[PDB]
């Protein structure tokens, strides 16, 4: 089946977990403590010396976006055709870009850089609002009329930014409605309300 | 057909160009000067306010890796099956990770950070040597026995690092042979030797 190996945080595993849960998939969580990680053996065995590590049968994967694309490819959450697949990729790359800036802030200079980051946020969120506006008036998904792995990744990005900058979605009707709509999906709603998700910190350094 | 809109540098368009050239594809280059870019209109029209911008017929794409995956998907350079596709993604994500560090050095702190970056390089290159060692003894491609978009991206990464740190591949026999082998592919060899490639700077700030 599926096994995700990660630290006890939502972080880079939040989106793929939302995906698995919403898609009704079963998976095993192998929790790695800082103690175990600092021992060194696990890290050494990781391709790029980092987690998450993912197992699908005897296929072992690394890189959160690789895991997302893999699940999207195998579960049919990658667009209806090549054109949509490319747009799904474009959205995910954009999500990843902002996630990297978010991660940099959280771990590199939260205190000194938070204000500038938040002032810059609207301009970083605008593209996703625009994408929604060009897709059925933003009434369905980020790309096409079927959910894709990019939807879960974007949803997570929006959720964590709401925590970082409460109200950051107020100026964006489509993104706001989108978050509420996707979060309301039965299986996802149940997962997001579960201790499995709720009792895990967003990040590893206690900042958010 | 294909049109790539970019600044007059190799940068993030080097790999996709190598791919198009080696695959015998025709494309148009729309060169954007710093003057034109600073005017602001073009940038404003870009989804994420950046280049490259790519056009495949009326399909407009942004994000270099999105363009690479799109070409890989439509040209059959994405593995022979789902397992390989996931491994191709894993390699590309790894390439992108190191490219971001490279870009950061080049534009953020070349002078002060070069030594530290170079000392760290071997550890950053090792994973690709390992991947090669696990795939037919590194005699074919990075994943499987057919070329993939990740091969062009990795080849470019290796080429620019040889310029940054001459001899950095001496400690990696498989990567070294791989670079020589792929670079020898007829169409690629011709492209790499052409003014179209040779007379373009690797980066935009004149550092390399």
From Swiss-Prot, chains A, B:
Upon changing residue 6 to F, the result is: Reduces catalytic activity about 50-fold
Domain of life, per lineage: Eukaryota
Chain positions found as Phosphotyrosine: 2, 197
Modified sites of kind N6-acetyllysine: 126
Positions bound to glutathione? 6, 12, 37, 43, 50-51, 63-64
MF terms (GO), sorted A to Z: dinitrosyl-iron complex binding; fatty acid binding; glutathione peroxidase activity; glutathione transferase activity; JUN kinase binding; nitric oxide binding; protein serine/threonine kinase inhibitor activity; S-nitrosoglutathione binding
Could you describe the subunit structure of this protein? Homodimer. Interacts with CDK5.
What this chain does, per the entry, is described as: Conjugation of reduced glutathione to a wide number of exogenous and endogenous hydrophobic electrophiles. Involved in the formation of glutathione conjugates of both prostaglandin A2 (PGA2) and prostaglandin J2 (PGJ2). Participates in the formation of novel hepoxilin regioisomers. Negatively regulates CDK5 activity via p25/p35 translocation to prevent neurodegeneration.
This protein's name: Glutathione S-transferase P
Species whose genome carries this gene: Homo sapiens (Human)
Q: Which gene encodes it?
A: GSTP1
């Amino acid at each position: 089946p599926y096994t995700v190996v990660y630290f006890p945080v939502r972080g880079r595993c939040a989106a793929l977990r939302m995906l698995l849960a919403d898609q009704g998939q079963s998976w095993k969580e192998e929790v790695v403590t800082v103690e175990t990680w600092q021992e060194g053996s696990l890290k050494a065995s990781c391709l790029f010396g980092q987690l998450p590590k993912f197992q699908d049968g005897d296929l072992t994967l690394y890189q959160s976006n690789t895991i997302l694309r893999h699940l999207g490819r195998t579960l049919g959450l990658y667009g209806k055709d090549q054109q949509e697949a490319a747009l799904v990729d474009m959205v995910n790359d954009g999500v990843e870009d902002l996630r990297c800036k978010y991660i940099s802030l959280i771990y590199t200079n939260y205190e000194a850089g938070k204000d500038d980051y938040v002032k810059a946020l609207p301009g970083q969120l605008k593209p996703f609002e625009t994408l929604l506006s060009q897709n059925q008036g933003g009434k369905t998904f980020i790309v096409g009329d079927q959910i894709s792995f990019a939807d879960y990744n974007l949803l997570d990005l929006l959720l964590i930014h709401e925590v970082l900058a409460p109200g950051c979605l107020d100026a964006f009707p489509l993104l706001s409605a989108y978050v509420g709509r996707l979060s309301a999906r039965p299986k996802l709603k149940a997962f997001l309300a579960s201790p499995e998700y709720v009792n895990l910190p967003i990040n590893g350094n206690g900042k958010q």
